[PDB]
Tab-separated table of C-alpha atoms and ligand atoms in Angstrom:
chain	number	residue	atom	x	y	z
B	8	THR	CA	0.037	-0.101	0.032
B	9	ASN	CA	2.903	2.502	-0.602
B	10	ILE	CA	3.026	2.576	-4.834
B	11	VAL	CA	6.286	4.165	-5.789
B	12	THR	CA	5.274	5.023	-9.084
B	13	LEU	CA	7.068	6.697	-11.861
B	14	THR	CA	4.689	9.783	-11.093
B	15	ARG	CA	5.517	9.996	-7.578
B	16	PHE	CA	9.114	9.535	-8.164
B	17	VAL	CA	9.334	12.528	-10.629
B	18	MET	CA	7.216	14.407	-8.420
B	19	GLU	CA	9.063	13.746	-5.252
B	20	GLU	CA	12.410	14.700	-7.480
B	21	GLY	CA	11.384	18.067	-7.556
B	22	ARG	CA	9.637	19.051	-4.280
B	23	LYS	CA	12.334	21.555	-3.053
B	24	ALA	CA	13.061	22.701	-6.875
B	25	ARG	CA	10.507	25.086	-7.888
B	26	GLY	CA	9.700	23.429	-11.282
B	27	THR	CA	6.360	23.953	-13.023
B	28	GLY	CA	5.159	20.579	-12.756
B	29	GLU	CA	4.979	20.408	-16.673
B	30	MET	CA	7.695	17.378	-16.830
B	31	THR	CA	5.692	15.515	-14.581
B	32	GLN	CA	2.460	16.306	-16.895
B	33	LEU	CA	4.698	15.082	-20.034
B	34	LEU	CA	5.907	11.912	-18.485
B	35	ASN	CA	2.391	10.942	-16.889
B	36	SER	CA	1.161	11.492	-20.562
B	37	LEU	CA	3.867	9.560	-22.259
B	38	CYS	CA	3.255	6.533	-19.870
B	39	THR	CA	-0.586	6.464	-20.933
B	40	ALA	CA	0.803	6.080	-24.487
B	41	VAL	CA	3.344	3.472	-23.565
B	42	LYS	CA	0.914	1.454	-21.682
B	43	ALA	CA	-1.729	1.841	-24.791
B	44	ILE	CA	1.156	0.370	-26.911
B	45	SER	CA	2.115	-2.294	-24.532
B	46	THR	CA	-1.316	-3.770	-24.610
B	47	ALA	CA	-1.600	-3.548	-28.499
B	48	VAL	CA	1.321	-5.305	-28.777
B	49	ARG	CA	0.882	-8.041	-26.529
B	50	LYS	CA	-2.125	-8.827	-28.516
B	51	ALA	CA	-1.296	-7.910	-31.900
B	52	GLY	CA	-1.612	-11.225	-33.674
B	53	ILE	CA	-5.264	-11.464	-32.473
B	54	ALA	CA	-5.781	-7.688	-33.248
B	55	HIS	CA	-4.408	-8.135	-36.572
B	56	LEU	CA	-1.758	-5.728	-36.008
B	57	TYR	CA	1.220	-7.375	-37.863
B	58	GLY	CA	2.208	-6.539	-41.310
B	59	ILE	CA	2.895	-3.179	-43.402
B	60	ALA	CA	0.756	-0.010	-43.307
B	61	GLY	CA	1.683	0.863	-46.965
B	62	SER	CA	4.079	3.699	-46.817
B	63	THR	CA	7.702	4.398	-46.359
B	64	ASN	CA	9.119	7.179	-44.080
B	65	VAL	CA	11.867	9.638	-44.839
B	66	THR	CA	14.736	7.466	-43.659
B	67	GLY	CA	13.393	4.612	-46.067
B	68	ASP	CA	12.110	2.044	-43.739
B	69	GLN	CA	8.860	-0.065	-44.869
B	70	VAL	CA	6.016	1.168	-42.461
B	71	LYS	CA	4.448	-1.395	-40.153
B	72	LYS	CA	0.636	-1.327	-38.826
B	73	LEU	CA	2.167	-0.704	-35.041
B	74	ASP	CA	4.142	2.035	-36.335
B	75	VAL	CA	1.236	4.043	-37.245
B	76	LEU	CA	-0.883	2.922	-34.195
B	77	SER	CA	1.999	4.080	-31.779
B	78	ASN	CA	2.891	7.173	-33.453
B	79	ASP	CA	-0.627	8.332	-33.424
B	80	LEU	CA	-0.790	7.340	-29.694
B	81	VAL	CA	2.411	9.424	-28.831
B	82	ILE	CA	1.463	12.409	-30.744
B	83	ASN	CA	-2.054	12.553	-29.113
B	84	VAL	CA	-0.817	12.412	-25.602
B	85	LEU	CA	2.075	14.826	-26.073
B	86	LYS	CA	-0.366	17.373	-27.430
B	87	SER	CA	-2.776	16.945	-24.718
B	88	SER	CA	-0.251	17.066	-22.156
B	89	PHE	CA	0.190	20.919	-22.478
B	90	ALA	CA	3.694	20.411	-21.821
B	91	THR	CA	4.943	20.445	-25.742
B	92	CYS	CA	5.479	22.729	-28.663
B	93	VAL	CA	7.594	20.902	-31.159
B	94	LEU	CA	7.654	17.158	-31.834
B	95	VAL	CA	9.842	15.142	-33.789
B	96	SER	CA	8.906	11.625	-34.828
B	97	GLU	CA	10.674	8.743	-36.817
B	98	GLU	CA	7.370	8.615	-38.756
B	99	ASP	CA	6.773	12.231	-39.687
B	100	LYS	CA	8.794	13.903	-42.504
B	101	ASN	CA	8.768	17.370	-40.736
B	102	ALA	CA	8.609	18.501	-37.103
B	103	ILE	CA	4.876	18.678	-35.638
B	104	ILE	CA	4.379	22.541	-34.110
B	105	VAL	CA	1.831	21.850	-31.317
B	106	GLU	CA	-1.132	24.273	-31.871
B	107	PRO	CA	-0.890	27.611	-29.417
B	108	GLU	CA	-3.402	26.580	-26.595
B	109	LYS	CA	-1.781	23.345	-26.034
B	110	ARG	CA	1.871	24.581	-25.933
B	111	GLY	CA	4.433	23.730	-22.775
B	112	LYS	CA	8.063	24.453	-22.868
B	113	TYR	CA	9.025	21.017	-23.992
B	114	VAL	CA	10.521	19.470	-27.514
B	115	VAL	CA	10.221	15.859	-27.692
B	116	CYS	CA	11.857	13.494	-30.159
B	117	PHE	CA	11.020	10.165	-30.461
B	118	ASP	CA	10.566	6.745	-32.072
B	119	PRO	CA	7.197	5.560	-31.376
B	120	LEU	CA	8.290	1.924	-32.231
B	121	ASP	CA	11.684	0.820	-32.310
B	122	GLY	CA	12.792	-2.974	-33.702
B	123	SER	CA	10.278	-3.236	-36.729
B	124	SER	CA	12.397	-5.964	-38.280
B	125	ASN	CA	11.601	-8.141	-34.798
B	126	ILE	CA	7.743	-7.324	-34.706
B	127	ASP	CA	6.340	-10.331	-36.505
B	128	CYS	CA	8.584	-12.887	-34.563
B	129	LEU	CA	7.386	-11.601	-31.366
B	130	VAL	CA	10.885	-10.455	-30.291
B	131	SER	CA	11.338	-7.404	-27.803
B	132	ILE	CA	10.334	-3.882	-29.268
B	133	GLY	CA	10.355	-0.618	-27.633
B	134	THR	CA	9.609	3.444	-27.699
B	135	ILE	CA	12.284	5.801	-27.622
B	136	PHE	CA	12.290	9.539	-26.473
B	137	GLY	CA	14.333	12.569	-25.630
B	138	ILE	CA	13.139	15.812	-24.048
B	139	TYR	CA	14.643	19.095	-24.360
B	140	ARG	CA	13.522	22.558	-23.038
B	141	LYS	CA	12.730	25.010	-25.850
B	142	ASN	CA	15.613	27.705	-25.687
B	143	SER	CA	14.528	30.558	-28.008
B	144	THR	CA	11.710	33.115	-27.767
B	145	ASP	CA	11.177	32.629	-31.411
B	146	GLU	CA	8.053	31.135	-32.633
B	147	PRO	CA	8.582	27.222	-32.044
B	148	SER	CA	9.839	25.524	-35.254
B	149	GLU	CA	11.785	22.487	-36.467
B	150	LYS	CA	15.002	24.218	-35.437
B	151	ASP	CA	14.109	23.946	-31.858
B	152	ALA	CA	14.636	20.080	-32.099
B	153	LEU	CA	18.040	20.628	-33.512
B	154	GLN	CA	19.986	20.728	-30.203
B	155	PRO	CA	23.000	18.633	-29.219
B	156	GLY	CA	22.182	15.503	-27.111
B	157	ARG	CA	24.091	17.349	-24.351
B	158	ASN	CA	20.916	19.562	-23.936
B	159	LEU	CA	18.253	17.044	-23.134
B	160	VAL	CA	16.773	17.169	-19.937
B	161	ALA	CA	15.259	13.533	-19.721
B	162	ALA	CA	15.320	10.506	-21.984
B	163	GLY	CA	14.841	6.890	-22.100
B	164	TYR	CA	12.827	4.154	-23.483
B	165	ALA	CA	9.898	1.832	-22.987
B	166	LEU	CA	10.770	-2.083	-23.601
B	167	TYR	CA	8.018	-3.983	-24.473
B	168	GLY	CA	10.065	-7.419	-23.734
B	169	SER	CA	8.939	-10.443	-21.366
B	170	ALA	CA	7.669	-7.599	-19.141
B	171	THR	CA	7.250	-3.920	-20.106
B	172	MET	CA	9.770	-1.555	-18.587
B	173	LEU	CA	10.298	2.259	-18.652
B	174	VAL	CA	13.725	3.507	-18.290
B	175	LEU	CA	13.973	7.076	-17.400
B	176	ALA	CA	17.356	9.150	-17.460
B	177	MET	CA	17.618	12.619	-15.937
B	178	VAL	CA	20.233	14.991	-14.654
B	179	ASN	CA	20.699	13.007	-11.303
B	180	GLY	CA	20.799	9.272	-12.883
B	181	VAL	CA	18.691	6.689	-14.311
B	182	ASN	CA	15.811	4.374	-12.798
B	183	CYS	CA	13.904	1.776	-13.942
B	184	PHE	CA	10.238	1.229	-13.657
B	185	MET	CA	7.980	-1.848	-14.429
B	186	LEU	CA	4.695	-1.520	-15.472
B	187	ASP	CA	2.274	-3.531	-13.295
B	188	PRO	CA	-0.295	-4.799	-15.820
B	189	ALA	CA	-2.960	-5.446	-12.987
B	190	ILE	CA	-3.299	-1.465	-12.111
B	191	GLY	CA	-1.756	0.205	-14.943
B	192	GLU	CA	1.102	1.872	-13.013
B	193	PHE	CA	4.894	2.220	-13.695
B	194	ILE	CA	6.617	0.812	-10.381
B	195	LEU	CA	10.203	1.807	-9.480
B	196	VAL	CA	12.212	-1.579	-9.553
B	197	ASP	CA	15.935	-0.435	-10.045
B	198	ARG	CA	17.158	2.847	-8.468
B	199	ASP	CA	19.969	4.908	-9.572
B	200	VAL	CA	21.251	2.423	-12.297
B	201	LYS	CA	24.862	2.274	-12.981
B	202	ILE	CA	26.580	0.250	-15.771
B	203	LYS	CA	29.497	-2.063	-15.019
B	204	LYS	CA	33.018	-0.596	-15.951
B	205	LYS	CA	33.686	-3.552	-18.177
B	206	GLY	CA	31.303	-6.327	-19.295
B	207	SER	CA	31.597	-9.663	-21.141
B	208	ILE	CA	29.183	-9.309	-24.100
B	209	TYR	CA	29.621	-7.459	-27.648
B	210	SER	CA	26.630	-6.772	-29.600
B	211	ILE	CA	26.814	-6.258	-33.469
B	212	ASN	CA	25.246	-7.524	-36.560
B	213	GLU	CA	28.418	-9.362	-38.163
B	214	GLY	CA	26.355	-9.618	-41.143
B	215	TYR	CA	28.057	-6.353	-42.081
B	216	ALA	CA	31.531	-7.920	-41.815
B	217	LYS	CA	32.321	-7.339	-45.565
B	218	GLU	CA	31.757	-3.576	-44.891
B	219	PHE	CA	33.245	-2.768	-41.584
B	220	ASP	CA	36.114	-0.402	-40.930
B	221	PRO	CA	39.544	-2.055	-39.978
B	222	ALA	CA	39.140	-0.726	-36.312
B	223	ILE	CA	35.581	-2.421	-35.884
B	224	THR	CA	37.306	-5.456	-37.577
B	225	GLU	CA	40.110	-5.559	-35.243
B	226	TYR	CA	37.949	-5.223	-32.250
B	227	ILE	CA	35.630	-8.101	-32.962
B	228	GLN	CA	38.702	-10.065	-33.639
B	229	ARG	CA	40.036	-9.106	-30.313
B	230	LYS	CA	36.927	-10.102	-28.486
B	231	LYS	CA	36.896	-13.774	-30.121
B	232	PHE	CA	40.770	-14.337	-29.497
B	233	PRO	CA	41.713	-12.117	-26.792
B	234	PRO	CA	45.331	-11.294	-26.878
B	235	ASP	CA	45.862	-12.065	-23.054
B	236	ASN	CA	44.116	-15.541	-23.103
B	237	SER	CA	41.300	-14.223	-21.349
B	238	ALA	CA	38.058	-15.815	-21.979
B	239	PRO	CA	36.465	-14.551	-25.273
B	240	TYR	CA	33.263	-12.234	-24.956
B	241	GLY	CA	29.883	-13.873	-25.726
B	242	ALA	CA	27.875	-12.298	-28.535
B	243	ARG	CA	24.381	-11.075	-28.272
B	244	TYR	CA	22.318	-9.036	-31.078
B	245	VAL	CA	18.692	-8.933	-30.664
B	246	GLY	CA	18.302	-6.835	-33.646
B	247	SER	CA	16.163	-4.142	-31.788
B	248	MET	CA	18.134	-1.177	-30.464
B	249	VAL	CA	16.095	-1.055	-27.235
B	250	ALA	CA	16.630	-4.338	-26.257
B	251	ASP	CA	20.275	-4.593	-27.108
B	252	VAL	CA	20.830	-1.505	-25.184
B	253	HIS	CA	19.005	-2.486	-22.399
B	254	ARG	CA	20.901	-5.636	-21.714
B	255	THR	CA	24.137	-3.550	-22.213
B	256	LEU	CA	22.942	-1.251	-19.240
B	257	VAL	CA	22.015	-4.094	-16.972
B	258	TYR	CA	24.638	-6.633	-17.704
B	259	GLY	CA	27.445	-4.435	-19.292
B	260	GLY	CA	29.478	-4.789	-22.235
B	261	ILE	CA	29.157	-3.002	-25.735
B	262	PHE	CA	26.753	-2.230	-28.178
B	263	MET	CA	27.608	-1.316	-31.935
B	264	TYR	CA	26.012	0.185	-35.024
B	265	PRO	CA	29.121	1.753	-36.543
B	266	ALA	CA	29.867	3.534	-39.852
B	267	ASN	CA	30.630	1.074	-42.655
B	268	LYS	CA	31.710	1.204	-46.332
B	269	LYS	CA	28.096	1.874	-47.386
B	270	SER	CA	26.984	4.249	-44.775
B	271	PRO	CA	29.513	6.626	-43.523
B	272	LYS	CA	26.892	7.968	-40.803
B	273	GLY	CA	25.632	4.517	-39.875
B	274	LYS	CA	21.960	3.364	-39.788
B	275	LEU	CA	20.462	4.619	-36.473
B	276	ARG	CA	18.759	8.124	-35.955
B	277	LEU	CA	20.468	10.682	-34.192
B	278	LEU	CA	17.526	12.795	-32.642
B	279	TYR	CA	15.284	9.740	-31.582
B	280	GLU	CA	17.642	6.796	-31.408
B	281	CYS	CA	21.209	7.379	-30.806
B	282	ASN	CA	20.938	10.871	-28.486
B	283	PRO	CA	18.386	9.351	-26.078
B	284	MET	CA	20.311	6.009	-25.741
B	285	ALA	CA	23.627	7.971	-25.436
B	286	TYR	CA	22.235	10.190	-22.533
B	287	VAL	CA	20.999	7.075	-20.576
B	288	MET	CA	24.444	5.419	-21.108
B	289	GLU	CA	26.003	8.690	-19.996
B	290	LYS	CA	24.061	9.071	-17.091
B	291	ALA	CA	24.610	5.217	-15.930
B	292	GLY	CA	28.320	6.083	-16.106
B	293	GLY	CA	28.760	4.698	-19.562
B	294	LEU	CA	30.013	6.147	-22.680
B	295	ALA	CA	28.499	6.762	-26.412
B	296	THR	CA	30.799	7.638	-29.277
B	297	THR	CA	30.600	7.351	-33.078
B	298	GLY	CA	34.082	6.015	-32.917
B	299	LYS	CA	35.481	9.684	-33.287
B	300	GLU	CA	33.181	12.158	-31.176
B	301	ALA	CA	30.873	12.064	-28.390
B	302	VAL	CA	27.292	11.270	-29.740
B	303	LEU	CA	25.739	13.825	-27.361
B	304	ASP	CA	28.085	16.705	-28.598
B	305	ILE	CA	27.013	16.207	-32.042
B	306	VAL	CA	24.937	19.352	-33.676
B	307	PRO	CA	22.362	17.774	-35.957
B	308	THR	CA	21.385	19.633	-39.085
B	309	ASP	CA	18.592	17.451	-40.096
B	310	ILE	CA	15.652	15.946	-38.017
B	311	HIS	CA	16.394	12.511	-39.561
B	312	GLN	CA	20.219	12.673	-39.599
B	313	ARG	CA	21.805	9.435	-39.073
B	314	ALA	CA	24.953	8.572	-36.428
B	315	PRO	CA	27.254	5.789	-36.021
B	316	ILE	CA	26.723	4.391	-32.520
B	317	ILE	CA	29.183	2.602	-29.993
B	318	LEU	CA	27.803	2.522	-26.526
B	319	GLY	CA	28.344	0.726	-23.221
B	320	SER	CA	30.654	0.142	-20.392
B	321	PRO	CA	33.210	2.688	-20.329
B	322	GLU	CA	36.439	0.483	-20.677
B	323	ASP	CA	34.812	-1.250	-23.417
B	324	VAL	CA	33.972	1.579	-25.487
B	325	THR	CA	37.581	2.968	-24.589
B	326	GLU	CA	39.172	0.176	-25.834
B	327	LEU	CA	37.454	0.512	-29.121
B	328	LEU	CA	38.133	4.222	-29.175
B	329	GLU	CA	41.947	3.376	-28.796
B	330	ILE	CA	41.638	1.219	-31.818
B	331	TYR	CA	39.960	3.911	-34.008
B	332	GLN	CA	42.657	6.237	-32.586
B	333	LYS	CA	45.509	4.070	-33.696
B	334	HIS	CA	44.076	3.377	-37.093
B	335	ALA	CA	43.456	7.262	-37.646
P	401	F6P	O1	19.287	-5.208	-39.057
P	401	F6P	P1	20.036	-4.347	-38.722
P	401	F6P	O2	20.882	-3.715	-39.804
P	401	F6P	O3	21.235	-4.914	-38.015
P	401	F6P	O4	19.354	-3.135	-37.911
P	401	F6P	C1	19.052	-3.497	-36.598
P	401	F6P	C2	18.658	-2.069	-35.895
P	401	F6P	O5	17.506	-1.101	-36.678
P	401	F6P	C3	16.456	-0.986	-35.984
P	401	F6P	O6	15.475	-1.740	-35.979
P	401	F6P	C4	16.234	0.761	-36.359
P	401	F6P	O7	15.919	0.654	-37.607
P	401	F6P	C5	17.163	-0.790	-34.431
P	401	F6P	O8	16.170	-1.167	-33.448
P	401	F6P	C6	18.257	-2.174	-34.657
P	401	F6P	O9	19.395	-1.745	-33.699
P	402	PO3	O1	13.606	1.794	-37.379
P	402	PO3	P1	12.799	1.013	-36.480
P	402	PO3	O2	12.550	-0.329	-36.051
P	402	PO3	O3	12.028	2.250	-35.431
P	403	MG	MG1	11.633	2.210	-38.733
P	404	MG	MG1	14.180	2.615	-33.845
P	405	MG	MG1	10.613	3.057	-35.377
């Protein structure tokens, strides 16, 4: 009978810190969308929600039925939250400007459904978000979303896996909340999460081996054949960024989606995939790099810009940076 909900947490983390309560509003609204997406996903084959929606998005993906449903759910709750002014979604070509009577101070970048390749085989999928405070006094516009990730005030993801988890990072740390399906509340289950300084798992799609740069190649070879005859790392690659990053957070190790000979900026999207996960990792004591610079320091020029990303345990990411620096 003492429910420590996401709501309470985010409020109790603010009592002697004169806010506006808009962030709690925003996050309460997002939680409602995440619950609705979770329920849909958990019944998707009965509800006939698998398959394509007939459309390609700006970054060239095959839009799925659950992409449109989730996108609509998040847009509508953020609008009605009265906490937002500019929204950027993977699924919309342009930024969405909130109508004047519903504007609040925040800019939200999100991936409404991440891991579409895994939808139909029931593997874990998720929702990814990053929140900024609007800076300018100018009328809200797409340019308010073009901030470096270091300006994030909150970021995180929902993981629709064996259980549904909302992982929320803010200035003071990372906390995990699990959805209780019986009462429709996110309950705190992991407080002030920190990543292991060094892990034992590497996560990458090795089908791209023919296209990797020499530094990624060398690093993978080192994980399999350690020069100091330590045990080789195990390999894991679920194929859904939210699942692979969440495992990296809670078990340690490294996740990679690097640049390659065909994709100079990699595949994952900077605003609503790379920056939120880089922020979570940095707040958990981890690192997130392109191989040459910190993801959170990139100043974007395109709301659908791609970025290479290598993230996880700091000693693992640093070892790979050392190999890039050696090859440079
Ligand atoms: O099939 P690939 O090229 O390994 O891409 C998988 C990645 O694509 C995404 O689905 C994003 O498009 C991520 O969730 C996942 O990390
Ligand atoms: O591109 P997608 O799996 O969010
Ligand atoms: Mg997609
Ligand atoms: Mg995604
Ligand atoms: Mg998506």
